[PDB]
Amino acid sequence: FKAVADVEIDFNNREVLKKYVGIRDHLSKEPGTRGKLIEALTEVLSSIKAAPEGSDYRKAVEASCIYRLKVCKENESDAAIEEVLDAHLEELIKEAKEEARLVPLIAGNAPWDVPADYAVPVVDYTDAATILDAP
Amino acid sequence: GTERRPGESGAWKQIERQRYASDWENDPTFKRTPKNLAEVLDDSASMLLLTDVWRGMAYTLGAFFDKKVTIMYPFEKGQLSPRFRGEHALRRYPTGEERCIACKLCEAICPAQAITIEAEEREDGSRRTTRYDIDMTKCIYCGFCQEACPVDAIVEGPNFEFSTETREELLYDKQKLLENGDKWETEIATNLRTESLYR
Amino acid sequence: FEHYLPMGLEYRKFSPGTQPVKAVVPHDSPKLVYDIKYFVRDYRRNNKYTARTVDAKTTFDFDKLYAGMPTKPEQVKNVTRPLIMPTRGY
Amino acid sequence: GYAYARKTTDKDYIASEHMQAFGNTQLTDYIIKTVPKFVKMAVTGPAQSSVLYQEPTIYTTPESLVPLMVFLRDHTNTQFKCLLDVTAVDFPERAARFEVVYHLLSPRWNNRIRVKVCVDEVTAVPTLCKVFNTANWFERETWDMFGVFFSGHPDLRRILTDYGFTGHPLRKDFPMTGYQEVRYDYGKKRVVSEPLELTQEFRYFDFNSPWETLNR
Amino acid sequence: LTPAKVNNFTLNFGPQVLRLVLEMQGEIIMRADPHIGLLHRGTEKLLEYKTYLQGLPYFDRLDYVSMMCMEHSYVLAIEQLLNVSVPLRGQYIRVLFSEITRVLNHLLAITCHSMDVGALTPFLWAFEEREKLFEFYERVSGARMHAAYFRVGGVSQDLPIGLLRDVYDWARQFASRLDEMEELLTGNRIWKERTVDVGTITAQMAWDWGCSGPILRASGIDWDLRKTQPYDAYGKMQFNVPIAGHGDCYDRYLVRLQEMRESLRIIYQCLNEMPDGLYKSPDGKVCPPSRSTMKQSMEALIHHFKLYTEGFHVPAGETYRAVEAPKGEFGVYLVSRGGNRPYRCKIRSPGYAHLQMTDVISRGAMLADVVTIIGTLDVVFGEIDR
Amino acid sequence: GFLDKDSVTERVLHVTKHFEKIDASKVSPAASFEKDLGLDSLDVVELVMALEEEFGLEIPDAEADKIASVGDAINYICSNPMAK
Amino acid sequence: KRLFGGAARHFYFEICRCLPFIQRLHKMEEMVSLKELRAIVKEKFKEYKDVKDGRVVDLLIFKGREEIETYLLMHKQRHHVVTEVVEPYYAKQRAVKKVTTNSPFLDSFLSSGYAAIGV
Amino acid sequence: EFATASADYSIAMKKAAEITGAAESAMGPKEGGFTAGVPLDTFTR
Ligand SMILES: CCCCCCCCCCCC(=O)SCCNC(=O)CCNC(=O)[C@H](O)C(C)(C)COP(=O)(O)O
Ligand code: SF4
Ligand code: SF4
């Protein structure tokens, strides 16, 4: 991207860029580290235990947390985690905190309580080029 | 320049923050602190003695001795193109017969509902209009009528200076439209001789 | 530094109604001049919607979902931005 | 907050392969499996985001709309932080004549979604102000244009019609030009609404051919 | 449920078309309640009684500062449900003229913001280039503002010969005009002190407040629809994205200027890559044929008769499409029943969303900054009130 | 008890006297708003407004809802401490 | 104790509470008193005395809240009061006991070929 | 086999019209007209 100021900014030092994009001011003054993300993921995994084991929502959240933890384990440099996850560590910290906070309301409402013969009508859209262009 | 300074912030939260926290120093977009007598004198020359107003002043003053783009209407006019959509008009054939054949495509296409058409067969068997009215106070000059007509009957002429003192004068009938077409035919035909390569 | 308001003949030398060269604007595809069949190219009236089966007793293995995701700085693949929208030869 | 400027270089790419493939083929199935109670009907549509993909559309009761929106904004896989707009459609043929529409944008993964709830004139719709600030004026405009009520709103009042205007102009039964017209009277020195009158009445044209098959 | 009791402070900010009611405990604003609808023309209901081609000029007068962008979203929404591919040359022309329109919108916005602040010279100076681009528009569509140029499947007419020459000639000095424009405000302490740290907005609030366009970019947010969800030939175009991180009026000013720079770059790239070929989609059953073709062929005459009276019948369905408008993200929701008129056409305007931020942003500010808030918001009530 | 049981009664009768929907002789020192007078809830609200206006007080809606008789109003006024 | 909890009487009581401020702010001291203003508001209520859904009554009350609130912030100028409040009262008390002895059907016949519509 | 114009969005309009709870709504005579807010004489014709 392009910096707006008339001055030259290196931007190769990651903290300088973090200052420029105002993460320090608007999102997190504190620099996010791998350990904080690990703590957040562990908290989410602890928090999701309020859901029944038979719920697929718990299953999906657990799978996401397991993948994120594997990413954190196999990666040492935080910039590597940024490259893998296409964001910054502070963003991931906010994501994990948000996902943990989502749990109590879902537990209080429990969307999984549906009859065994619950029916979901599904409609799919098919393009005309499917039968018109070269197979 | 685009750099920022302490005290030049236009707020209170930010001003109170910078005079009681060095957070602006961590920001690279803020001009860094002077470190010697030379840099202090440079900063003083920046703040005092203006030196920022002076440049814009000089540029405006050069603009004073500069040329202008002003035109002397009505003795001078602007630049326009044949595609210009102006006053609607009715066209004829060179023998003198009306081009409009009351196919009512123009009325059908007009989203302004500003066209009122009545027609019947003429005494010679010709299919001609009996009432052809377009409300200029209601016409939006979109030119969609000029696009729809397949005989080049209705055209938006190059006339654009046709303001009237009363609103009633703009209730264009068949007769005034034909008058306008007979007046402006040559210019419209010349423009069509160009627009034909695109239309 | 460039000056506004160029002098005569440096800008808009010719009026639009007096182009020095005749204009040849195509108005049909040379492929479709004599082969005018339309059913092979009626995309509009051939789109379809289908009501799929009741998606209730399905098995969504998130394992397969997360097995296809990268784990390192390398091995990361990104879908390129398409240059243009489809034109179908025109 | 997301979509922060991370790379200093130009990007020739849009999203990642796995995430795009999921969001374009199994996103709807993921939504169905996660919260089937929140799911009532599923349509994957013309992909608001781009002409070359597929995107889903959600139908549900007004009861669970708020938790569904909460999950859709807050889920780690569905970070729909941008609610574009809230509007409605009139279906006078149906028992419930209103189809309220909810649109979301996910800058985290360059995606979008549509959420719809079908209600009648006398059923409340819980407000989404607590979930999105922008819903305030959208709910206001929807109420002004259709009379769709939103329970728990801070202050639900007309925003686009006249001050003393009664009625919802975007209703299908609402006349195109209406009932009242306004003019100034010299005698009373006041600008007053009067029964609508037209020098030339509107002309409606029936072009719909008796042969078209696409009519629905 | 609520009485009046304490009258105390009372204010009325302007019947003349924004009506503003504010609340101050003195010199500092605590509440600000805009009232709108003085320009609500009820177009959306009016759209239902018009054909798709008939209703097209409605989109000219939604944002009369930026027109072709408004046309483009509706046209794309029609075409996607119509499953129609746009020719390459038409896409080039659309993108180039859209960049010119974006330049006009940025110019007029910045000049009006300056005049509200107190600078009058850039207003007059930039309106000369604005007149130049109006001449460009008139040459290609015969209308200065309400061109109605964009069409379903392409454009109404091809570019007249000799237009790109003057386009390049204008671009050869537009950079100098922009440079002389900047020196009047860029290096000024007064302009900054008026604009710096006024109306600060966060990324979290902005995504909560549904921001789009340059305001989003000034919060450290990497987002352009032309790079994330590209349409037409924008994917081929190579250009930069200005990025700021304060959410400041000065920051938005600089962001808009750099956006103008990038628009000029895209204009150059389009100028040097103009292809030769068809400008309208070859489907005569949707696109009108040539007048020469109409006057010598029965089939084209029949299609001209039918389309110009009844028009093409969009298949029943629904879609929403948005375009990276100069004022933000301009989107239109299209509901199709199967006929020749759109059943329900909802219009989304970015300025309407931005205008909703006044109360929270104007808090803690001063009456000298409300005008600053409105000017930097870059709002046209035509799109705000439809 | 905050006021006299008589003067309040004559003031109530006088403020009742100036209603167009009522019969001047049908009004009794003790009556019923519904059965005797044939007046609805809104008329009772208007009655409460007139009484409060003469007596310079304020009555919340619930107390007015509890009020349905002339004696009700008289005893309510006499029980009001802000009485004048 | 009352139909649908009697929300209608509570709404009328609230509007009557808010009424005198409207009279003072809009200079109706020299046209009306509190009593006949209250009578006007009462007659406004009688338009829907036969509604059988509590929900419809709630929405009616909410729209009436909006009308009275836009009355409160003076958003409707004096001309609105002229055209809806005091001149209708003057007409109602003015054309009392008209001297026309013809039936309404015959009145319509002598009026026009169609019945009158609108106000 | 079921085939009644089974290649269009109309099926998506067939459903969402039979949604449970949404398909049991009912209103009394003249009740919806009260919600209209139009002049009362509209119903006299
Ligand atoms: C400046 C003033 C502005 C005014 C604007 C607001 C105007 C609002 C007017 C419309 C409000 C309503 O009708 S509210 C709708 C009221 N209707 C219902 O609730 C259904 C049952 N009918 C009743 O309750 C009646 O009041 C009744 C039969 C008399 C019961 O007799 P009582 O009463 O003994 O109880
Ligand atoms: S002006 Fe042209 S389009 Fe209109 S009725 Fe006459 S011939 Fe037909
Ligand atoms: S130019 Fe447009 S508004 Fe004017 S008559 Fe022709 S179609 Fe109608």
UniProtKB/TrEMBL annotation, chain C:
From the Swiss-Prot or TrEMBL record, give the protein name: Uncharacterized protein
The root-end lineage is: Eukaryota, Viridiplantae, Chlorophyta, core chlorophytes, Chlorophyceae
Q: Which residues of the full protein are shown?
A: 29 to 118 of 118
UniProtKB/TrEMBL annotation, chain E:
GO cellular component terms given for this protein: mitochondrion; respiratory chain complex I
The entry's keywords:
NAD, Oxidoreductase, Translocase, Transport, Ubiquinone
Record-annotated NADH-quinone oxidoreductase subunit D domain positions: 116-386
Its BP terms in the Gene Ontology are:
mitochondrial electron transport, NADH to ubiquinone
Q: Which residues form a coiled coil?
A: none
State the source organism's domain of life.
Eukaryota
GO MF term list: NAD binding; oxidoreductase activity, acting on NAD(P)H; quinone binding
Any keyword Oxidoreductase?
A: yes
Keyword Transport attributed: yes
Query: In which family does this protein belong, per the annotation?
Result: Belongs to the complex I 49 kDa subunit family.
The name on file for this protein is NADH dehydrogenase subunit 7
From TrEMBL, chain F:
Q: Which GO terms describe its molecular function?
A: acyl binding; acyl carrier activity; oxidoreductase activity; phosphopantetheine binding
Which pathway does UniProt place it in?
Answer: Lipid metabolism; fatty acid biosynthesis
Localization of this protein: Mitochondrion
UniProt family annotation: Belongs to the acyl carrier protein (ACP) family.
Chief location = mitochondrion
Q: Where does the record place the Carrier domain?
A: 6-81
Q: GO cellular component annotations, sorted alphabetically? A: mitochondrion
What's its job? Carrier of the growing fatty acid chain in fatty acid biosynthesis. May be involved in the synthesis of short and medium chain fatty acids. Accessory and non-catalytic subunit of the mitochondrial membrane respiratory chain NADH dehydrogenase (Complex I), which functions in the transfer of electrons from NADH to the respiratory chain.
Self-association or partners: how does it assemble?
Complex I is composed of at least 49 different subunits.
What is the protein name for this chain? Acyl carrier protein
Q: Which residues of the full protein are shown?
A: 45 to 128 of 128
Instruction: Tell me which UniProt keywords the record has, alphabetically.
Output: Electron transport, Fatty acid biosynthesis, Fatty acid metabolism, Lipid biosynthesis, Lipid metabolism, Mitochondrion, Oxidoreductase, Phosphopantetheine, Phosphoprotein, Transit peptide, Transport
Automatic annotation (TrEMBL), chain H:
The protein's location, in the record's own words, is: Mitochondrion inner membrane
- Keyword Transit peptide carried by entry: yes
Q: What is its main location?
A: mitochondrion
Gene Ontology, cellular component aspect: mitochondrial inner membrane
Tell me, what is one Gene Ontology molecular-function annotation carried by this entry?
A: oxidoreductase activity
What keywords are assigned to this protein?
Electron transport, Membrane, Mitochondrion, Mitochondrion inner membrane, Oxidoreductase, Respiratory chain, Transit peptide, Transport, Ubiquinone
- From the UniProt record, list the coiled-coil ranges: none
Q: Which domain of life is it from?
A: Eukaryota
Work out whether the entry's keyword set contains Ion transport: no
Q: Name one GO biological process term.
A: electron transport chain
> What does it do?
Accessory subunit of the mitochondrial membrane respiratory chain NADH dehydrogenase (Complex I), that is believed not to be involved in catalysis. Complex I functions in the transfer of electrons from NADH to the respiratory chain. The immediate electron acceptor for the enzyme is believed to be ubiquinone.
As for family, the record states:
Belongs to the complex I NDUFS4 subunit family.
Stated name of the protein? NADH dehydrogenase [ubiquinone] iron-sulfur protein 4, mitochondrial
Q: Indicate the span of the full protein covered.
A: 19 to 63 of 187
